[PDB]
Amino acid sequence: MVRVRFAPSPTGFLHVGGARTALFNFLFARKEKGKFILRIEDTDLERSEREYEEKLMESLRWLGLLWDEGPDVGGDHGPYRQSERVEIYREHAERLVKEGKAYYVYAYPEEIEEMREKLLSEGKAPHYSQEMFEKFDTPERRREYEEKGLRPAVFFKMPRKDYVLNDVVKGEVVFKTGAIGDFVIMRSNGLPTYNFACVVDDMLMEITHVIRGDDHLSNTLRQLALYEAFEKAPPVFAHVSTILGPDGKKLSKRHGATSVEAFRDMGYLPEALVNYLALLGWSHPEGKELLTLEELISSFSLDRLSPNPAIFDPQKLKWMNGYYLRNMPIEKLAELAKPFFEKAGIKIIDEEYFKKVLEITKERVEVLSEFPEESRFFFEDPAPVEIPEEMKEVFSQLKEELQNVRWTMEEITPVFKKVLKQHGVKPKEFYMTLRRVLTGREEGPELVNIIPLLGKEIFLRRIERSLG
Ligand SMILES: [Cl-]
Ligand SMILES: [Cl-]
Ligand SMILES: [Cl-]
Numbered sequence: 001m002v003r004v005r006f007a008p009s010p011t012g013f014l015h016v017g018g019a020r021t022a023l024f025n026f027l028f029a030r031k032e033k034g035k036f037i038l039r040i041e042d043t044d045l046e047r048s049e050r051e052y053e054e055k056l057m058e059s060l061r062w063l064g065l066l067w068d069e070g071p072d073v074g075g076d077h078g079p080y081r082q083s084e085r086v087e088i089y090r091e092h093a094e095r096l097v098k099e100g101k102a103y104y105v106y107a108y109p110e111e112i113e114e115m116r117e118k119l120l121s122e123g124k125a126p127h128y129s130q131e132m133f134e135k136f137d138t139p140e141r142r143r144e145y146e147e148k149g150l151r152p153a154v155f156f157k158m159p160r161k162d163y164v165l166n167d168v169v170k171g172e173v174v175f176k177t178g179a180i181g182d183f184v185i186m187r188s189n190g191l192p193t194y195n196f197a198c199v200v201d202d203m204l205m206e207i208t209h210v211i212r213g214d215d216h217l218s219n220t221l222r223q224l225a226l227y228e229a230f231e232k233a234p235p236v237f238a239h240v241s242t243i244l245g246p247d248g249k250k251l252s253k254r255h256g257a258t259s260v261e262a263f264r265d266m267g268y269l270p271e272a273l274v275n276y277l278a279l280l281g282w283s284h285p286e287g288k289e290l291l292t293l294e295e296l297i298s299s300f301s302l303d304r305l306s307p308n309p310a311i312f313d314p315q316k317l318k319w320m321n322g323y324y325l326r327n328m329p330i331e332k333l334a335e336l337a338k339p340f341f342e343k344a345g346i347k348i349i350d351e352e353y354f355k356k357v358l359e360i361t362k363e364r365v366e367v368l369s370e371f372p373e374e375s376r377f378f379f380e381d382p383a384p385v386e387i388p389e390e391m392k393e394v395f396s397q398l399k400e401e402l403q404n405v406r407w408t409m410e411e412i413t414p415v416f417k418k419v420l421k422q423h424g425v426k427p428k429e430f431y432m433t434l435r436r437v438l439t440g441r442e443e444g445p446e447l448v449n450i451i452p453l454l455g456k457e458i459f460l461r462r463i464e465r466s467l468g
Helices: 016-032 048-063 082-098 113-121 139-147 194-204 214-229 260-266 270-279 293-299 314-327 330-343 351-361 368-374 389-401 409-423 427-438 447-453 456-466
Strands: 003-006 035-038 102-105 153-156 163-167 171-175 183-186 209-213 236-240
Touching (some): 016 048, 016 236, 016 270, 048 260, 082 194, 153 214, 163 214, 171 214, 183 194, 270 293, 351 447, 409 447, 427 447
Parallel strands (some): 003 035, 209 236
Antiparallel strands (some): 102 153, 163 171
């Protein structure tokens, strides 16, 4: 009853816009209990470049946007790669030509681009017609195409009529007669164009709803004409928001990390990204932003898709990441954090100690790559700081006092108070110097939490090492 698809052209990196579009299809499919199809637009890719498809699928599974039908999982409406469907598109292109709805063209791609510019220089519209290509239909050119392994490109006769798109998000989009001209549906190298392959697959795969970025709205005119050519009712269209950077301009390189792979490498969580990606072109009825994946599926709907653009907020994504990172189960937070420590040179053998070190320091990190430098003092002894003159005697006495004591603040704190009062040393300056002895920094977690986690041996060793 309900069938949606994500149709990416794999480049190796799944960007935020793609990830967002795949999420909206996933949520809709899950809510309505329909199917979510993955279609790889690998027409121009080589056999060697299948690793881009492997990386895009990996990133979708990392985000948890699992699909029902696809190149690996299979399905009754396959194959799911456009490279493997070349004969299906050819079969459909020739059918339009036989019905007088399309036609063959023998002009090169280096040419056409010449007459494109000739029409523009002459003030005319850049709209193609069948009579414009008759110049190139000569026996010499047909021989040159045969001898060079080329086929004539198939062009679609664009009819002189109005097309009305009743979009779910954008509403009524009138494409007035004489907007565009004739266009290429099959190229001279035997491969299809995006629009033609898109329509043939949307029909054959029985797509009910096409949810995609609004940058494909112009292309919908070319697709609606093709649906009419094949005499098949088109699917429901939902054109989602354009993702802009924080300054208003289109999201890009200059705005920071743009790929799902880049966020994973920096240390972002899938639940954080998915929740944030959900907010780029949709809102919860009551404006709720911290939603679980179950909450998104339940609350999501096509009537709440914004017709306006989504502005990317890196601070909000990073803050939202910190939220999930702190409320995540410690068992899971440990396995996700461990590689960042190993990459940073800190080796982790004690699993119980590691969970305790992360439980304290998690309140100070928003991203997983921040953990190693923040929690470094808990593993490696810091640089020895010069203990001031009046306290040298106080710090040296602590080795003796704290030797026969249970290693807990309830027993350690009264010993500090006794020695400080006895010597006539103010506590503010003692606790400041003690931080520098144990941590080697001006700030960090509460000293009450740091001291007990480190051993008695680790506490005393750092005092004597700092000055002696
Ligand atoms: Cl698409
Ligand atoms: Cl061509
Ligand atoms: Cl302090």
